[PDB]
């Protein structure tokens, strides 16, 4: 659950990178991100009850 709801926060970080810059030359290697997911999991494994 935290993985998916944390992954949707990445999906939005995907939809803001592609809509600008150079729409021709792009790879998911520039379109993804770590923190929206990484921090999402790191948060659960510690702060949750």
């Amino acid at each position: 659950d935290q993985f998916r709801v944390g992954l949707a926060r990445l999906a939005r970080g995907v939809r803001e990178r592609m809509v600008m810059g150079s729409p021709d030359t792009l790879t998911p290697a520039k379109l993804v991100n770590s923190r929206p997911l990484e921090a999402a999991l790191r948060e659960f494994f510690s702060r949750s009850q």
Partner: protein, 162 residues
């Protein structure tokens, strides 16, 4: 056309050899698709066989094109707008464009300016990323790893490479 083992270029992937052709199911009917792989990436690529010349799928230069590129590298320049915006923008587009003659031609003026006044923190990446595709292209054509490949530019530059 590109045969199984053709050495090609796929912007901005630098260089890669074609593995072959296959029918990939995209949407509706599956059109034929070229395959470009890059062992120094472990990435993957699918290029439509319809209009390969529209995706900027060129091929690695021949060993014959080394000197010409070098000559346009040492001397050849080109004017660019003063405000960093347009200048760096143009340089960037030229980079992603995948054109060794243009990337080298650019590298010339960029070099002339770097040791004069000195290159901004932007045009620096616009130079580095420029010499990168070159140094690797030389490694594809002359089959000499980035060590030797970069050792080439040293002559037509006057200084070594990073």
């Amino acid at each position: 056309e590109f045969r199984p083992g053709d050495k090609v270029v796929l912007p901005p992937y630098g260089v890669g050899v074609v593995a072959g052709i296959a029918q990939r199911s995209v949407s509706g009917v599956s059109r034929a698709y070229y395959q470009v792989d890059f062992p120094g990436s472990r990435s993957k690529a699918y290029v439509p066989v319809e209009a390969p010349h529209s995706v900027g799928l060129r091929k690695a230069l021949a060993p014959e094109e080394v000197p010409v590129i070098l000559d346009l590298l040492k001397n050849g320049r080109m004017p660019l707008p003063k405000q960093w915006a347009a200048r760096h923008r143009k340089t960037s587009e030229i980079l992603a464009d995948g054109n060794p003659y243009r990337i080298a031609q650019m590298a010339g003026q960029l070099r002339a300016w770097e040791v004069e006044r000195g290159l901004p923190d932007l045009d620096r990446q616009a130079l580095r990323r420029a010499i990168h595709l070159l140094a690797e292209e030389v490694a594809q054509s002359l089959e000499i790893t980035v060590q030797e490949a970069k050792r080439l530019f040293e002559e037509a530059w006057g200084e070594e490479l990073n």
